[PDB]
């Protein structure tokens with residue numbers, strides 16, 4: 099916290115008294131997320147309820163980020179653990195999850211791709227920083243939408259910087275010993291991309307742990323209909339390959355989806 | 363650790379080296395009037411773990427602990443019974459001895475009983491590193507499980523979009539990992555072949571985990587056993603048998619050998 103207070107540029111340093119908390123817009127064990135106001139901006143605030151090290155990491159990551167497909171950091175409060183809070187821009191159009199599954203708004207192909215492309219661009223950005231960042235929690239809740247249908251990647255509370263005998267191991271043990279890479283994000287993305295196209299929650303009929311289990315152990319993936327365009331189904335098939343190294347880099351995901359926009 | 367298990371370096375008479383690795387070296391020797399094997403080695407946490415496991419062990423199909431030296435990090439040493447008949451891996455792959463089906467099953471059942479034992483202790487133990495190097499043979503062709511350096515005591519909505527490799531890492535190890543390992547050992551035993559002989563170990567571990575590859579089952583393997591094998595190396599841990607059931611079926615086979 100002393101190391102952080104020193105390294106984080108001072109313009110980001112916020113006092114809790116500078117923040118006005120309106121509503122709660124999201125929740126969790128970690129803490130709650132309020133809509134509010136700060137330095138004459140409409141903002142979203144994550145407030146916290148090893149906890150120190152989690153918060154110091156998250157700020158260290160957020161303050162690196164500048165890209166129009168990634169949530170815009172505004173500042174944090176670093177006084178003491180009790181005060182701890184994180185502030186970002188607010189985006190009115192709400193989560194992608196809501197759009198698809200609650201409001202059940204029916205989007206056309208162009209609109210869907212724009213979103214897919216924007217998210218891929220944000221991930222590309224993160225993965226190709228000098229010191230790559232893994233989001234590690236990409237989902238339709240953490241894809242937020244501008245009124246005009248563009249999208250940004252949010253919530254870096256699980257994010258980590260990428261760091262710099264097996265013949266008889268059970269697969270799940272072998273997988274524990276292998277440190278995960280930026281490729282984990284691509285797998286999450288793939289599901290998001292299917293979620294967008296179908297309108298459907300992955301394994302909608304299953305509780306989260308069961309769905310994970312099926313993907314992980316029984317190697318199941320959501321159904322790929324014949325009507326899904328080829329270049330996309332390809333990306334899906336590759337993107338959620340159990341073998342991480344077989345998943346495409348986001349730079350290619352972008353390239354392909356932008357092609358589709360040219361042909362849309 | 364129980365005071366009687368404490369050992370001083372002077373109580374241990376070293377002889378030749380019998381094994382190696384980045385971890386350290388293993389010696390044959392003599393201690394407290396018995397022929398022994400001696401192992402010699404964040405890094406301290408893992409030693410107490412290994413020792414706290416070994417002292418608990420008391421079963422004919424599991425290695426016998428004898429004691430351990432605790433003076434300082436430089437002096438750390440673990441001492442066990444020495445077993446004259448070498449490693450199974452050797453017998454199978456270097457010596458290449460031809461065994462009857464009975465001899466094979468005797469080893470298979472012995473290893474299974476040792477694993478059963480471990481798994482059904484009040485506070486169960488996962489070996490986490492079973493293989494034909496750590497299966498040691500008595501001259502009479504009985505076998506024991508060895509080398510507990512990797513062994514662990516069993517510990518008591520984002521998940522839906524997680525990559526498998528990440529989900530696996532947020533999940534706690536189970537005893538069913540040993541069952542998978544055993545399956546391979548069992549196939550190895552029956553066929554005499556190293557699993558995926560044509561591949562280097564990581565290539566093998568990848569193919570088993572990602573591309574769901576398993577060893578080939580030919581008429582070389584009997585039907586009742588081959589059912590066990592397939593279930594044993596299931597991708598789903600929960601689909602794999604418990605070692606109790608392995609024992610039953612394999613003893614049932616021994617009745618018919």
Ligand SMILES: CNS(=O)(=O)c1ccc(N2CCOCC2)c(Nc2ncnc3[nH]cc(Br)c23)c1
Nearest residue numbers: 124142143144184186187188189192239252253
């Ligand atoms: C402090 N910002 S943050 O990036 O750490 C952050 C984390 C989580 C969330 N929620 C996302 C939806 O599931 C619940 C958590 C948000 N939410 C939002 N951030 C901006 N504009 C927003 N508009 C609507 C919403 Br909800 C919204 C921010």
Ligand SMILES: CNS(=O)(=O)c1ccc(N2CCOCC2)c(Nc2ncnc3[nH]cc(Br)c23)c1
Nearest residue numbers: 381399400401440442443444445448495508509
């Ligand atoms: C201190 N005993 S221990 O259980 O920690 C232990 C760990 C590893 C090994 N080696 C096994 C073979 O690959 C290399 C490591 C052994 N070795 C042996 N222990 C008993 N009798 C033995 N006879 C022949 C051999 Br080798 C042998 C013990």
